[PDB]
Amino acid sequence: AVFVPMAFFGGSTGAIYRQFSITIVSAMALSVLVALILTPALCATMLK
Amino acid sequence: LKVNQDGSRVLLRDVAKIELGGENYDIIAEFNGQPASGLGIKLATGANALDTAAAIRAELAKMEPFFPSGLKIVYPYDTTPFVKISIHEVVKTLVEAIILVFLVMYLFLQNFRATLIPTIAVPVVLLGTFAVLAAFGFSINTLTMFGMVL
Amino acid sequence: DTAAAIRAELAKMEPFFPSGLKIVYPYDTTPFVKISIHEVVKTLVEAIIL
Amino acid sequence: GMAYLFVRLPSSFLPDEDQGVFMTMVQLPAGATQERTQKVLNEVTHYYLTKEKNNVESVFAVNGFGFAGRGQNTGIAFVSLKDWADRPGEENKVEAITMRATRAFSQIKDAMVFAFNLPAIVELGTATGFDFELIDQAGLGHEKLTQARNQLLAEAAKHPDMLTSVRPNGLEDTPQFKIDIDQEKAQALGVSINDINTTLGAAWGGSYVNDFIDRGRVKKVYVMSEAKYRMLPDDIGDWYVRAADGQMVPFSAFSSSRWEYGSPRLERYNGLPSMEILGQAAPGKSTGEAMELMEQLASKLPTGVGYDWTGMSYQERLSGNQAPSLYAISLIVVFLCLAALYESWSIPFSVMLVVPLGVIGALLAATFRGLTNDVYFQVGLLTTIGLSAKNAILIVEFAK
Amino acid sequence: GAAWGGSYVNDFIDRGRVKKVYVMSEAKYRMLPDDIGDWYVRAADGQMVP
Amino acid sequence: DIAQVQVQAKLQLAMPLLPQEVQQQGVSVEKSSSSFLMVVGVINTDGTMTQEDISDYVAANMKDAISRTSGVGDVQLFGSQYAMRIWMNPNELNKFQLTPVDVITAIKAQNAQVAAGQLGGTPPVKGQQLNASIIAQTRLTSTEEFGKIL
Amino acid sequence: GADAKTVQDTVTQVIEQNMNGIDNLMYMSSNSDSTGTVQITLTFESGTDADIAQVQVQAKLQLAMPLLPQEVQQQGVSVEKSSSSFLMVVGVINTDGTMTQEDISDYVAANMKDAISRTSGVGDVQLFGSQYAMRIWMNPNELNKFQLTP
Numbered sequence: 001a002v003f004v005p006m007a008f009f010g011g012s013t014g015a016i017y018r019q020f021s022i023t024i025v026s027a028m029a030l031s032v033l034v035a036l037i038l039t040p041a042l043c044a045t046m047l048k
Numbered sequence: 049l050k051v052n053q054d055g056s057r058v059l060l061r062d063v064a065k066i067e068l069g070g071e072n073y074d075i076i077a078e079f080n081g082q083p084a085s086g087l088g089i090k091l092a093t094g095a096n097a098l099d100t101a102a103a104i105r106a107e108l109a110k111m112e113p114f115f116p117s118g119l120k121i122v123y124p125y126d127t128t129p130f131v132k133i134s135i136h137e138v139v140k141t142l143v144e145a146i147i148l149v150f151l152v153m154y155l156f157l158q159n160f161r162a163t164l165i166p167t168i169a170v171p172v173v174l175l176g177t178f179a180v181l182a183a184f185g186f187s188i189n190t191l192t193m194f195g196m197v198l
Numbered sequence: 199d200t201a202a203a204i205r206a207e208l209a210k211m212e213p214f215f216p217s218g219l220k221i222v223y224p225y226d227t228t229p230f231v232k233i234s235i236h237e238v239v240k241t242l243v244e245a246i247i248l
Numbered sequence: 249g250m251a252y253l254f255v256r257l258p259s260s261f262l263p264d265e266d267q268g269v270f271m272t273m274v275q276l277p278a279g280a281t282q283e284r285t286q287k288v289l290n291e292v293t294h295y296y297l298t299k300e301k302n303n304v305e306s307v308f309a310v311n312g313f314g315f316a317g318r319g320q321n322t323g324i325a326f327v328s329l330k331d332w333a334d335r336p337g338e339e340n341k342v343e344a345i346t347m348r349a350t351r352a353f354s355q356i357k358d359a360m361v362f363a364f365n366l367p368a369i370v371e372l373g374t375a376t377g378f379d380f381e382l383i384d385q386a387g388l389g390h391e392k393l394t395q396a397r398n399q400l401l402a403e404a405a406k407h408p409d410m411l412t413s414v415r416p417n418g419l420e421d422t423p424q425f426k427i428d429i430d431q432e433k434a435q436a437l438g439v440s441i442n443d444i445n446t447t448l449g450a451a452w453g454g455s456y457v458n459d460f461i462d463r464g465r466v467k468k469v470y471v472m473s474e475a476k477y478r479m480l481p482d483d484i485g486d487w488y489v490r491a492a493d494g495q496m497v498p499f500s501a502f503s504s505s506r507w508e509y510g511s512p513r514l515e516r517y518n519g520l521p522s523m524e525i526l527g528q529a530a531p532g533k534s535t536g537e538a539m540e541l542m543e544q545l546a547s548k549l550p551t552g553v554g555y556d557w558t559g560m561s562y563q564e565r566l567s568g569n570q571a572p573s574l575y576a577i578s579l580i581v582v583f584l585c586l587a588a589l590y591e592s593w594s595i596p597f598s599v600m601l602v603v604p605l606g607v608i609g610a611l612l613a614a615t616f617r618g619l620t621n622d623v624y625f626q627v628g629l630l631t632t633i634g635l636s637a638k639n640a641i642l643i644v645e646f647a648k
Numbered sequence: 649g650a651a652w653g654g655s656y657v658n659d660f661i662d663r664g665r666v667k668k669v670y671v672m673s674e675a676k677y678r679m680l681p682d683d684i685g686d687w688y689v690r691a692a693d694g695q696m697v698p
Numbered sequence: 699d700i701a702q703v704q705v706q707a708k709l710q711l712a713m714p715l716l717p718q719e720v721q722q723q724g725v726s727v728e729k730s731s732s733s734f735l736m737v738v739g740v741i742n743t744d745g746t747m748t749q750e751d752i753s754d755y756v757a758a759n760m761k762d763a764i765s766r767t768s769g770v771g772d773v774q775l776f777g778s779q780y781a782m783r784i785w786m787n788p789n790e791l792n793k794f795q796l797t798p799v800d801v802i803t804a805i806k807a808q809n810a811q812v813a814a815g816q817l818g819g820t821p822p823v824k825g826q827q828l829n830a831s832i833i834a835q836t837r838l839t840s841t842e843e844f845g846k847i848l
Numbered sequence: 849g850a851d852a853k854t855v856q857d858t859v860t861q862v863i864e865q866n867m868n869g870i871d872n873l874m875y876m877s878s879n880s881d882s883t884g885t886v887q888i889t890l891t892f893e894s895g896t897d898a899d900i901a902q903v904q905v906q907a908k909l910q911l912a913m914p915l916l917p918q919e920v921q922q923q924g925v926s927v928e929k930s931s932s933s934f935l936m937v938v939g940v941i942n943t944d945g946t947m948t949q950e951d952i953s954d955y956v957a958a959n960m961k962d963a964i965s966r967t968s969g970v971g972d973v974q975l976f977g978s979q980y981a982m983r984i985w986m987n988p989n990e991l992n993k994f995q996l997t998p
């Protein structure tokens with residue numbers, strides 16, 4: 001909600017604030033997919 | 049052109065000089081004060097930039113062997129090496145962000161395995177981002193690679 | 199939207215007219231869509247109150 | 249302190265980087281030749297070679313082709329700098345190289361030679377810079393449009409005013425040799441008007457005749473004249489056109505020699521004549537202020553003279569109108585999403601004033617050093633809102 | 649063709665904007681069928697022919 | 699968009715086998731929607747002019763701008779743009795022994811712009827100081843100048 | 849050969865009145881030099897497909913082509929995608945078997961220029977020199993000797 005509405009671009013600065021969120025916004029949902037899957041698993045399987 | 053009375057022939061060379069020269073003498077280049085020509089290729093408004101410049105060397109490479117004596121290619125004003133530096137000083141910064149994070153995870157937690165879960169977490173997310181930008185439409189721009197560091 | 203930009207060019211032309219030249223508006227499609235929005239969103243409010 | 253370090257912090261778009269490559273252009277005055285501009289292109293090539301061996305690998309000069317347009321006056325050299333490793337300091341960087349290069353061309357030269365950065369981006373988005381254009385809406389000519397443009401440039405430079413910088417794009421105005429051919433004089437002696445038009449046209453200007461073959465590849469054939477018989481005005485009479493009565497007739501018989509004043513670059517905007525005005529914003533003012541203080545100067549001009557903003561700039565900018573709208577909706581949705589997982593009218597507000605905590609520090613590092621609020625800094629703010637919300641949500645989640 | 653129907657000859661300039669030039673004839677010499685004979689074409693022997 | 703291109707990329711092949719009168723005339727391939735929407739009338743109140751002076755000003759100021767803006771299909775001018783109109787008198791032609799063919803030749807000769815060369819040409823001699831463009835015949839402007847065609 | 853105001857209303861203005869009925873358009877600029885070279889730039893909205901936008905502009909120029917000079921028709925008329933700026937600028941020189949700044953420019957335009965502009969979608973190529981051509985230099989004194997003209 002901070003990044004995606006900032007990426008509603010207007011004019012010749014089209015792929016500037018646009019690519020400045022959607023790029024890193026996919027990385028947010030892939031890190032929440034890496035924190036809901038994967039990280040839970042590796043911590044239980046092998047820690048101390 | 050003509051045949052004057054007495055059987056004399058007026059030819060085109062007799063009335064005018066004939067040399068095989070250029071069609072336009074308005075411009076002439078000089079590479080380091082040396083007689084030269086060139087090929088200033090400009091983009092096609094939406095082209096792939098470096099992929100276009102890679103195929104400029106595709107045609108050029110097959111032309112090289114059939115040159116006369118002396119003819120040699122030289123490379124001024126080039127955009128190609130700037131994108132090679134933007135990949136080699138961002139993926140290098142990518143590795144410097146992982147190694148520096150490795151030291152912070154070891155100081156707070158002495159366990160080697162604890163400085164390993166976050167080390168495999170972020171590279172997996174970095175690759176997943178490439179798959180999203182490929183499926184939607186974007187590319188590996190100067191901007192989207194700076195998004196990987198941020 | 200095309201008819202809105204017909205008034206865009208026309209508006210910049212108005213000031214540089216000679217003496218007497220004036221614009222007039224017969225046969226117009228614009229005001230019919232303004233009535234179709236104002237007597238449907240008005241009917242929208244009359245359906246909520248009822 | 250968060251507000252004060254924002255307004256005073258200037259607005260750019262994208263930083264002009266060292267790209268390992270730059271260039272410089274040339275411009276000679278009214279009616280220069282190929283030989284005169286070549287002297288200027290040589291002196292420029294010497295500054296980059298003998299006086300800059302460490303920083304320049306090569307040069308690629310050109311005689312009669314600038315990035316403005318074309319002609320025998322213009323020119324352009326394409327510099328290819330050495331690799332980044334062999335150039336250590338800030339002295340051997342594009343900013344410093346083009347600084348003392350422009351000084352050398354304004355000191356020991358009698359022309360208009362410059363040197364500009366390699367911006368990337370496009371031609372637009374200079375920041376604190378505009379592009380005006382002056383249109384002739386009514387039925388005035390070229391001579392009337394010239395006087396209107398001189399009154400616009402003069403009025404800007406005579407009452408500033410947190411000042412300005414304004415010059416034309418390329419309407420230097422040079423003479424043109426007109427040849428009035430009297431029609432009644434021609435037909436009396438018995439010469440066709442068709443024959444006379446391709447005697448003057450083919451000889452001086454050249455003429456496309458026919459296609460021939462050379463070594464396999466089909467090329468063109470051109471007919472013109474030896475250089476020495478078409479340099480000066482006195483060589484007009486040397487050409488003799490043939491009449492129907494089988495005798496020669498000189499060009500001086502029917503023609504008439506007299507100079508005039510035209511323009512070597514007639515620009516047109518949208519079906520009407522026009523003249524580009526390349527001016528920029530002040531060091532104090534910035535874009536929005538400069539453009540509206542150029543609009544009331546255009547209205548004070550004579551009748552049949554309107555205007556239109558040509559022509560990269562703009563539609564709606566970035567730190568201007570856009571940013572307020574982007575950050576506006578960003579707050580609206582952040583508040584809603586801190587409620588689907590929380591449920592209150594207090595939790596959202598705690599996260600909604602960690603915003604100025606991270607922003608005061610961001611504006612401190614940018615304003616202190618020689619950076620500015622451009623694209624890279626603007627999105628650095630939103631990452632800080634994601635890390636100030638993140639850390640504060642840990643403070644709110646575990647505590648509740 | 650040029651007299652009755654008109655004919656596109658060449659482009660000229662008027663007040664800046666390039667327009668067309670047309671050649672035809674005064675209205676009264678091309679209304680009825682009897683005005684055909686009023687036009688005289690020139691022959692090679694330097695005399696007119698109706 | 700694409701359907702318009704295919705239709706006008708086929709008309710082009712048949713263009714050479716048409717009359718030379720039709721080629722120079724307006725050939726147009728435009729998107730159609732049998733019906734108008736905005737029909738902007740134009741009149742005069744104070745400084746009165748005819749139904750011809752008004753039609754020229756519409757076609758020489760606001761017609762080219764309207765058809766180009768916001769994707770207009772095709773504009774129909776209700777009148778006509780101005781043009782150097784001539785009315786050949788047949789009785790006066792016979793007085794001086796002339797035809798409409800000789801009138802058309804006089805306008806395609808005097809009323810015509812010629813492309814002259816330039817002092818100090820594209821390939822000059824080394825050491826020339828000046829370089830200007832030569833002007834020759836100019837297209838006639840007013841009604842008075844057309845009256846003085848010999 | 850034509851001067852500035854010759855090309856301003858014989859080539860430029862003719863196209864400008866016939867540059868209508870185009871989908872998407874912000875503005876249109878123009879230039880006309882004394883060297884005899886005109887260049888219009890029809891800018892469209894942001895990222896308007898440059899493929900279809902190129903066709904509409906050159907499917908309208910075609911209708912105005914018959915009302916241009918016959919000199920300009922046979923000359924190079926071109927509608928290409930533009931990106932004001934170069935990227936690859938391949939210089940070409942000689943070292944051993946020395947030739948001029950004209951022999952090199954012909955070989956570039958008669959071997960590697962046609963291949964480069966066609967490959968990987970190039971917008972428009974600018975030759976820094978000129979292709980060879982059977983060049984003739986008519987002497988005016990020798991023409992008068994045998995009674996002749998250009």
Ligand SMILES: CCOc1ccc2ccccc2c1C(=O)N[C@@H]1C(=O)N2[C@@H]1SC(C)(C)[C@@H]2C(=O)[O-]
Binds near residue numbers: 275316362364
């Ligand atoms: C390149 C920026 O040239 C600039 C830019 C800004 C200025 C502000 C004030 C005073 C001067 C300048 C110049 C200036 O002195 N240039 C002079 C000129 O003439 N031209 C130039 S630039 C040009 C190439 C568009 C054109 C030409 O040669 O046709």
Ligand SMILES: CCOc1ccc2ccccc2c1C(=O)N[C@@H]1C(=O)N2[C@@H]1SC(C)(C)[C@@H]2C(=O)[O-]
Binds near residue numbers: 185893894897
């Ligand atoms: C709702 C998600 O809209 C998106 C998302 C991602 C995109 C990635 C690339 C390009 C577009 C988009 C759009 C998209 O559809 N927006 C636009 C659209 O229409 N255009 C843009 S960008 C543009 C300039 C290439 C073009 C135009 O204006 O003609």
